[PDB]
Design a protein around this nucleic acid. Structure first.
Ligand SMILES: [Mg+2]
Ligand SMILES: [Mg+2]
Ligand SMILES: [Mg+2]
Ligand SMILES: [Mg+2]
Ligand SMILES: [Mg+2]
Ligand SMILES: [Mg+2]
Ligand SMILES: [Mg+2]
Ligand SMILES: [Mg+2]
Ligand SMILES: [Mg+2]
Ligand SMILES: [Mg+2]
Ligand SMILES: [Mg+2]
Ligand SMILES: [Mg+2]
Ligand SMILES: [Mg+2]
Ligand SMILES: [Mg+2]
Length: 131
RNA sequence: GUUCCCGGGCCUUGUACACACCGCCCGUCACGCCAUGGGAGCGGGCUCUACCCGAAGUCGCCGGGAGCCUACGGGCAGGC
């Protein structure tokens, strides 16, 4: 038997292919489905992805932003049906795969440390030219 | 005999006494009221210095791996 195969099979019905690829350092807007009273709505979360744990279907990514003076980090499973869409708002360039270190930097230092990844920007504009 | 004790007469001298020496008056200790100083400290106001971070905005640089406008030796966006 192939135990790994069986797993991926069970998993397969929930796998998404529709979301955009993104790298740690990028700034992103995640439109998340949320429930309150009594309705469900779409609530946006916009920050830098500071980490990407990979485990196939169980890959999860972590996003950090400052909201009204306090730092907030959000963790999302990448194939969560509760995510409507993810919009890349900016490509950034880390030299490092996990970016825990920006937790201790000023807004100025971060801007210096994570410069726009101009390469993937042209690259994003190279597409976005449909036929 | 008039030194002494009581009372009085005259001159004089001292006085913070004049309710007039059966006058006045000082400080502690006890009690009560009020205010003030000190006092381990507690709380508040204002202020000074050094550094970290830093909105809007002006000003300066850039405006390219790069957008929009051309009025293209430019401008705006945008970045520092
Ligand atoms: Mg496995
Ligand atoms: Mg099989
Ligand atoms: Mg006599
Ligand atoms: Mg006589
Ligand atoms: Mg006399
Ligand atoms: Mg006497
Ligand atoms: Mg006192
Ligand atoms: Mg005092
Ligand atoms: Mg004090
Ligand atoms: Mg004080
Ligand atoms: Mg310091
Ligand atoms: Mg400064
Ligand atoms: Mg130009
Ligand atoms: Mg400008």
């Amino acid at each position: 038997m192939n135990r790994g195969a069986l797993i991926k099979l069970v998993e397969s019905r929930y796998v998404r292919t529709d979301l955009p690829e993104f790298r740690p350092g990028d700034t992103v807007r995640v439109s998340y489905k949320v429930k309150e009273g009594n309705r469900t709505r779409i609530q946006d979360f916009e920050g830098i992805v500071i980490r990407i744990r990979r485990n196939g279907f169980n890959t999860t990514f972590t996003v950090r932003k400052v909201s009204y003076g306090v730092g907030v980090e959000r963790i999302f499973p990448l194939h969560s049906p509760l995510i409507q869409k993810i919009d890349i708002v900016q490509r950034g360039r880390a030299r490092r795969a996990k970016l825990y270190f920006i937790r201790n930097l000023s807004d100025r230092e971060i801007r210096r440390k994570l410069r726009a990844d101009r390469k993937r920007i042209d690259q994003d504009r190279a597409a976005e030219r449909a036929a």
